[model samples]
Target: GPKFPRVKNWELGSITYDTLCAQSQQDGPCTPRRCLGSLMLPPPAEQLLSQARDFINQYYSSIKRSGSQAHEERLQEVEAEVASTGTYHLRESELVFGAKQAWRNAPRCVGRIQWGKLQVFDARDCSSAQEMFTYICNHIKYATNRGNLRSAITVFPQRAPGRGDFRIWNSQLVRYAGYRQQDGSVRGDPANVEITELCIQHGWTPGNGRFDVLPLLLQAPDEAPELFVLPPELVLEVPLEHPTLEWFAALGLRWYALPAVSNMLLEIGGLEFSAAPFSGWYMSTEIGTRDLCDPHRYNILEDVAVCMDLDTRTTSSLWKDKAAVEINLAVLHSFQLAKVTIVDHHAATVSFMKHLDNEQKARGGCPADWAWIVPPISGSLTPVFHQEMVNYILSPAFRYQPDPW
Candidate 1:
């Protein structure tokens, strides 16, 4: 039996275990209770009530009316709403505040410094799947910014009591297609083969390239899902190459500039927006280390190593490490030359440490996931690797949603 270390974050009242034990029969091997998935639980009624009271108090204080009649009235309203509905809805102003707080409270993100500056687009009025596509296209256009990246989150309507939830099937707005060949080999990104097959099954015209952007599958309440292709001009892909390695460009490596995670649900107060798509600038490691280097992904380390004439015969030669560094370097260099906004792991980790210090002073403690905060390439080299972290769930949070077919 495999065991995972349980880490607790008292401020957010959450416990998280490493995802290594995916086959665990009952959460974890612990007795009496089971370990839940990472940050999967919604806030309890009492917790929501407490958070609402705190938010209301903070709102009144910011408006220069501490403990005013309006504040007391809102508290009573929250209590009544929670008692009747099991959860309360946030006001427009409160939603904005909560969205920012959610980004600030995200355990995995290393870019929380821009949390307050995100452009929050409220698309809660969308009533059709086509409308969801329009909002998504608009988000891609606005956030792409023609090489100048901006953090943005477009939130669709929250799940209703008796209505179906609106959702985007694609994990990201910009992703390449993965086709499984007849020989049981993956032609493109193996990570996306299932979704890619689903697209083809839904009548999408599949492409035969390594970098074809997948169409979005938008679903609305009580309606059939529809596939919509993004215009090529809106995508903003950068062809990757190294500064000195002339052969690197021939590898045909390219990636989308925007890393818009579309599958995550945005929960504010107790309401869940299952169709919220959020975007931020790319960190080089995400594209280079995980997307390009993972064995189940692009799997290009050996190809690049062969090009570099590295000794790939054995692991003792560190060819993988050597090749990975060059790949990450190329990603950083290419994005910089293309004038696309990207952060290197060193600078990102340094900034993250600063964010942690700022949060500790402002909010007692910062919630973070050590495995995510550390860079994939050089884990121990970054400042975040040595720092202890506590991962947890906060009311305003972004969470992984189920795949909608």
Candidate 2:
């Protein structure tokens, strides 16, 4: 959806010569009323307002630093930014949600591959793709900045919040690229990097998948360092199994150790952060404490085990009371596979689900009617697993798959 409204040629608000000129100056031999030079038309008020709003919203913490006052105070701040000679002319861009994955036909063969590349996208230049995603995720609300953007490190101030409803934290999960070792020092490459994000929301529970930022990449730190590595290369351990393997382990019923299973699912914690909201992840060791370090830089080394709630907002909206299932859309590049795993983390009984669609739904198929009871496996030791979870309640990919234990 488009964010900015189209600026009209005539209907736009403006000030006339009578308004811009002082009363005493207005008395001079006025040029003809119809003269082009006689009438003064200031630029559209919206041009200034849009930039001011974006600036204030991004650096809201700075605006709130001053005591909250009447509405006029807020407008004054906006005016000040516009009046400044050095204010930037930043334009809003689009974020790409997994549109490719959504518009697919089947899980095993969701859709045909358009790009020759195996992966849908890479983390190196994914800021725009994710920002596009924000357009959909935040379609219900106002939006701003790229999903991978960050506050400028060199200039501009930060924004904070009060108890007011105006505080908008449309901030997204910051992406950090893991590093690898090459010539003595860690090889700082985007491809070698691992992908991890830290959600900056308030009271976010890590295991709930509601608060804790989800791991985007299926590759390991050592395997995909270039995809996530930052400059100066801050290297960290693989912790345990990678996220892709963890996804398979979560399934628990695989008889063979086909490690070729593509996606890994590690309940790990090691993300990087940066000041730019869209600057994405940079290198750092600082832990979360409201300090001046990137939130993604700190490692989530421990396993997160929250009693999964099946009926959460994100789950309900996406899956609708069925169950939450994390799938690896990267695998079936040619023919989409039902690559889903149920995240049943309670009572040691992990379950797997399938991906059904409208066709199956009309046939009365749903997660409540069909789902696999996953057994314990050796490698499935992470806090959370990305197993397939499809509830039969809704039919054909009955979503709402949350850990029911």
Candidate 3:
């Protein structure tokens, strides 16, 4: 009963024990059958008091007032409320604290280093699509900050026991619309084709441009989703150009300033907030390697390779690698030129290393997935490559919700 999982880092020859994991009362997908730790998601949570108690404990511990008078009574206050109404409410400070904790606990994010600095916007009072749109616009403008991006999350109302859940139909707040062609090829980002069609079906005028930002489909409880187009001026876009290659600028490759994930559910103290959209500056490889170079997304490798006149016919020429690196440079250069806040993979990884150490010293362990922690381009070149990691879900958390339509 006293045994805890002891962790080891092969690269730095470090050792740690997962003391925090002992507090997880929620059931995951493993139970002596098989461990699905490497997968992107896990199972669920339960029995309100079990979770709410731990979260309140964490809140008290966070303030260095564990076992104090307020901590003990707050624990009792929760039980009384739950016994009467089968639910309890989180204080305003608790929501903000839990929001940061969720980001810190997310295993796939390489940007956990900034979790403590998130600007939490409370949209719990939002009641309609128009109000949601207004709240989102405020979040966008505040987070964008004229290209000086800041980390932020706008938390909406929690999922009550009776009615429908509020949701942002789009996976991300800002995504390029995908236009399906008659010949079976996609014109814009194929990753967003489903969402793009949803927007059109909900009465959005389709745009033919490659970089068209999709309109938001906001769903308030028990209602058909409504469409709201983003104000063009609020969206800060960076036109990509290479440092030396003038032709790259003519390609008209560009991306938006904010990377706001809107469809994920935020869980805090056994409460699920179904519409919490969070945004932050993007890492370089996210735009360059995955979004642009990935075959399923933009599939621009061949085009860029051909323009560079590389030996694309054979794999030995490393044409794909060269083109991807240049594209990454172009993204970095363009974002910097546009005065937007963006981090290169190297810097992101280096900062992640520091975050890991910080968490280890603070919480005895940090949940991380090695597959996601390592950058897409460079595996062995990064510190995370050689470091062993563990992935587990912790609350307050952000979990992916099913598509609205």
Candidate 4:
């Protein structure tokens, strides 16, 4: 580890060196003055041919045909097209590989153990918002699969030199409405307030419920985004209830089944896919901790605590922690009862440990962000907490894009 970053697992008395990090091409936000490694977002382009060449080499390398005549010709062919048309295209197989690679290269994902099995749907020929909606609906239907969710992504057209970018306005394919009240508090998922307002302004009649599903704002290049409502049946919801606490069912709390993130940009080689939406099954903590308990989101911890007769007066009782545990238990129980696909935090992190070992053997070292890999609740209890990780950029990659509004 003399020339590379040394990684250590404090819990297991094991150690590793991040030799794969040398393959990363860009610097993170970390500087001598500050280690910005824990920040959520750190924000690309150009030298297209070289970047493209690097990707082709990787593709060939994957197939044990690196530097072969076909590989050489494919590289030459890409360069020829880039020179003449200013852009090149991916074959169906290449597109599939790139999409999966993006998932594998995503440092923040705890579910990368399933990265290789993602279904990639190519929708590059779509020319209108209507077509985009159809494609998205198909993605939802296929991925949901009657609550047996499959990891899937639908790739829209890539950005071109002379055209406006195609975009999905929602952060996810399925999200609850957030209505800002006169009292200045949110009624639903507060994170969706801006998108909800945008939907209302675009001629959507607002729903007043706490769990109303918002419409999709699909934008084709150079056009105003169009509102497309998801059919109620397609949007699966699981009613949350506790196994032991019978009163928990009376709360009427629920969450959508699919977690399709719609706004992320998918970058393959140097090609930018501005509207590739992807989804996976959820980890319970993602719902129980961040979504329901985050103060800015549902802010449901106090309500849940009050229901459980938890002492709300002081921190010594560990009321917040105790209530959070039951809330998460309710999520797991309800999802299991509904026969929906969901993983608890403990199992998810354990599987992630297997993934780290897999990546270590496949590639010299796996790039990981220690902050993101650990679950929101019980961070120290998880296996990834004591595992030092090397965070860096890798491609093909999934990246956050600006809101279309």
Candidate 5:
């Protein structure tokens, strides 16, 4: 049939109305058969034991017609399918008691976030200016209490002729917010030495001299209290050419695709570090962006006053309070109620999401997550809870993090 001009460079979009509402209420029955060895054959062990006895007789006839909410929703969907299958992947004395309770529960203080880049300090007190007024009211109190959002679908991974890959697509989910105005009151009480000399003439700091605000808080006398992190659902790693587009272009990510590729063209209100730095096109960084592989990729030291956008399915970044205060002050409290079980060293995340997608397709940009590890790196326990609640708000010597609201 001669079809391989990169399968016509693979462009078959539109399906994301939440995968067409989970494919019109998904339950079972979808195979108008279109090749891939008739979708990976294996289902005749007596029709998979008569489809597992018709899913246990329609799960005990819906627990005898809705008993205890259908057996508590099929025991929470078989305990989330036994915590993502492979028979509970990581186990060996609970991975050594979860690496000794992740170093007895870490987090002493570590912070980093960068959006629209610029800041070394326009804050240094009242818990770092109350985490910069909760990052300018997490984008103006979720865009004045959740006002806009539409387009929300993310399933990733495609290609199936003998069923080599699966899970289809559909896209739309844009949301963002940010605000701070000064209504001319002769701008009086400009304390903290006049907003650190007007944010060091705009470029924030680290260069053009002038940057000593009163012996820098008596030389760091503990200033913790910051970690509101909950904005990481904006995925979109698009870029291909592969061992099957190298695992869907290094782990097919498309959570929101930041309003479909950098806010409709490239204003880049969120995520950085991969599209640049050693952009070998998909995965190569000896560190990246100049240090070659890892001189901490240009090290910012603190510059994330975020305001990212582009998930507008008409409205939803969950009622955008300035995209929830710019993702809870650049992730001030890393949110997650019952979804934590880390372990994806799968060859170091397919070689750091394929070197940040071959350095964002060699600089023509688009692909990041700075190689993603996201568990609890520094001694463990860091799914982001505001970098361990800014070291338990500075001093107890560190180790506390819990209240992630």
Candidate 6:
């Protein structure tokens, strides 16, 4: 067996033996056992029973339905249902609670401090991909919130046996196009190259620009996917500019205000919303460091460094570091000027530490992924870097789902 570094979860304060096992097989070529589609298995019968009980109790507690026959009956009913069918459905209120809880239990998110405040849109009654498109558009408009960027999730119908799952084919609601050049290079965001190609293959009129927003691939149960271009007015984008550098704005760089991830499944108790797209406000480093500066991503470090008249020949000159700081500063400054809600990595980490403390007092532990919790820039400078965290699975949770091609 291969060895992997043990990563602790911050919330549960326990070692992630299961995640480590899952990650081990993923380190090499994908086996059917370790494929993305198989990564998120439905919770086992026992786990489902436990989750149902906890959700039922929480539901009762929150709705002031405690000590009532209804509470006891619901608890008994959930237990019996899971015992017989290996799953149970959450009530409408429980669904809302579970959605928030899933956000709270998202180990990788640095923005979980606002978990309790998310707007959960129930679209379980949506019968068509067209309706899902409407709901998604509404979600983008509402969550973008004219740059206020409220945390939100639009939950679709639950996954049922023998029923085709409703899914959004796009990874995120807002993503720039990635045009694969004839020379095998990418013109725009390389990360979205596959999806971009898929969109074009599915009859989308591809644009020849660096910042073209890709169309959505909306799929209903057993239906051929439908391509829907998001309305330009609904999407809010910020043009990047620096405070001191006048030439920065000339780079023609812009990014969408909302980062609504649509591919992940939201699991609450035993039920899974295969089309629950969730989002939070962006942290500056996500755009500035990883998205723009990562070698495999935009690879803009050298460009920015050259623009700043820095020595690119020497690694010791810290040109990348200098350029990254300016880029991040530009992102924060641009977002502020645009009235968009964006947090610098420092402020976000500080808030995360506060969240950790709050969770520790309230729930005895906080689950976190160290790699994700640490900012891409100035890792050691943040308080979270110095702290040891434990990671574990807790339902409701947002788990990565397979791409619906």
Candidate 5 Cα lDDT to native: 0.22
Question: What is the lDDT of every predicted structure here?
Answer: 0.82, 0.21, 0.89, 0.91, 0.22, 0.83
Identify the leading candidate in terms of TM-score.
4
90-193 in candidate 4: lDDT tens per residue? 88888899999999999999999999999999999999999999999999999999999999999999989788999999999999999999999889989999
TM, every model: 0.86, 0.19, 0.95, 0.98, 0.17, 0.87
Give candidate 4 misplaced runs (Cα > 4 Å): 43-46
Per-prediction tally of clashes: 0, 92, 0, 0, 59, 11
Off by over 4 Å in 2: 1-45, 50-70, 84-233, 239-405
Candidate 2 whole-model C-alpha lDDT, 0 to 1: 0.21
* Candidate 2 lDDT by residue in tens digits, 1-405: 233222121222321111111111112222357423222220344554653443333233323543345334654655665456323222221001111111121122211122011121212222232332332223211111222212111101111111111111122222222343355332221221332221212222223211122222211111211121111111111111213334432422111000111111100000011111221121111111111111232211111111122333353343311211221111211011222111122222221122222323322221211112222222133211333222211101101111111
Candidates in order: C-alpha RMSD to true structure = 6.5, 24.6, 2.2, 1.5, 24.3, 6.1
Model 5: residue 379 alpha-carbon error in angstroms: 6.3
The parts of candidate 5 lying over 4 Å away from their true place are: 1-42, 45-47, 54-58, 61-63, 66-379, 382-405
TM-score (C-alpha, index-matched) for candidate 5: 0.17
Please give, for residues 1-405, the per-residue lDDT of candidate 5 as tens digits: 322111111122211111111111112223347322212111223333332233333334423653566545544454454335311112122222222222222221011111112111112121232333343233223321221222111111111113221110111112111111255221111222332333333334422211121111100112222222223322222221122122322322111112211011000101010100000011111111111111132111112112133343445443233332232222111111112111122223334334323323432222111212332222122222111111101000112211111
Candidate 6 has an lDDT of 0.83
**Worst 10 contiguous positions by lDDT, candidate 1:** 20-29
Give, for candidate 3, the lowest lDDT window spanning 10 residues.
37-46
Residue 8 in candidate 6, Cα distance off native in Å: 13
